Paper text:
Proteolytic processing is achieved by two cysteine proteases, the papain-like protease (PLpro) and the main protease (Mpro, also known as 3CLpro). PLpro is responsible for releasing Nsp1-Nsp3 from the N-terminus of this polyprotein by recognizing the consensus sequence, LXGG. The PLpro monomer consists of an independent N-terminal ubiquitin-like (Ubl) domain (residue 1–61) and a catalytic region with a right-handed thumb–palm–fingers architecture.
To elucidate the inhibitory mechanism of YM155, we solved the crystal structure of SARS-CoV-2 PLproC111S-YM155 complex to a resolution of 2.1 Å by soaking YM155 into the SARS-CoV-2 PLproC111S crystals. The structure reveals two common YM155 binding sites on each molecule, including the substrate-binding pocket and the ISG15 binding site. At the substrate-binding pocket, YM155 forms hydrophobic interactions with the side chains of P248 and with the aromatic rings of Y264 and Y273. The most dramatic change is observed at residue Y268 on the BL2 loop. Upon YM155 binding, the main chain atom of Y268 forms a hydrogen bond with the inhibitor. In the YM155-bound structure, the aromatic ring of Y268 inserts into the pocket and forms a π-stacking interaction with YM155, thus clamping the inhibitor to the protease. Together with Y268, YM155 occupies the P4 position of PLpro substrate and blocks substrate entry. In addition, another YM155 binding site was observed near the thumb domain. Unexpectedly, another extra YM155 binding site was observed at the zinc-finger motif of chain B with unambiguous electron density.
Author numbering: 4 to 315
Write the structure that this text describes.
Amino acid sequence: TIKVFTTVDNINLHTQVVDMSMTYGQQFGPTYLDGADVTKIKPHNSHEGKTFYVLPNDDTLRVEAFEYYHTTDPSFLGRYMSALNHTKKWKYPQVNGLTSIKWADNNSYLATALLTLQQIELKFNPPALQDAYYRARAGEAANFCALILAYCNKTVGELGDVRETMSYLFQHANLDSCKRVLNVVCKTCGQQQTTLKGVEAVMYMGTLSYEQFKKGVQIPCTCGKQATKYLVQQESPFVMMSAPPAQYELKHGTFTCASEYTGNYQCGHYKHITSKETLYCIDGALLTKSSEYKGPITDVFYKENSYTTTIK
Ligand SMILES: COCCn1c2c([n+](Cc3cnccn3)c1C)C(=O)c1ccccc1C2=O
Ligand SMILES: COCCn1c2c([n+](Cc3cnccn3)c1C)C(=O)c1ccccc1C2=O
Ligand SMILES: Cn1c(=O)c2c(ncn2C)n(C)c1=O
Ligand SMILES: [Zn+2]
């Protein structure tokens, strides 16, 4: 017999008396010690007093996991631990002032997402995610990346999509005050306003150019004609404009940052472009400075506070 603590969040610890003859799995279920899976292992005397992670297998643990991670998915903790085993071994160099990720396990979409998150104003709601985010900002990004994978249902090594990653993350962010008002104008059907809130207020698919969005983009109408959709009002600290990858040029001073994608879904690679005093292409640990940039851009991020159209 030894005494240990079990936990699902490393915040609320639960005393346990362990029997030395059974494995950890037989008496607790799947169990982790400092990230290492110990389910199959017999207890050691040197384990006394240590903290073990277990799966949320009763109502106290389920509620604690829910409050810390904001999910009820039973597989969450295990997928997070599997990911964390790998992400603790990645390297997080500081590149042009931001925490990046040295390439490994097809992780360029995560590097681009992490770099983007450090340049827009955002607050995550789950305590685990926001805590890991602040550590990632300071340079210890392993937990944040493992959590990103867990929330997106991705495993280490899988190819990822930045727009989809951002959408999952934004679902967990406090964007409830973000508002977008759009107008669609058809010569036959007339005008129709729409109001969008939260994630849908800050994300748009179809054009990369915020300016074009404000002037109007051509979209189809059911009446057979082409209508014009334009941005009437925007309240948010940033917006994200996406479109299928295509040759596009980024002008210094007109955007905050952007994602470039080369390849397809079987095989590809993201790079990150940011606008500072001049343009920088952060490519994992690699850094290239240039005054112009052209490439297959797929997402562009813009600062915003409050915008109202002057179209009549
Ligand atoms: C932070 O405010 C945002 C409002 N909110 C909260 C949640 N969810 C979504 C959700 C996601 N996965 C499963 C079920 N529900 C929203 C939209 C929680 O999960 C939650 C859990 C424990 C204490 C507080 C909260 C909480 O506040
Ligand atoms: C023009 O097709 C629009 C839909 N789409 C997209 C993709 N593909 C496959 C493909 C195959 N060969 C070359 C290029 N793309 C299609 C058909 C992406 O791989 C992709 C990767 C990263 C961000 C967005 C996208 C994206 O939107
Ligand atoms: C620049 N680059 C890469 O660096 C890369 C890649 N696939 C894997 N890597 C690492 N592709 C398609 C690529 O264009
Ligand atoms: Zn019409």
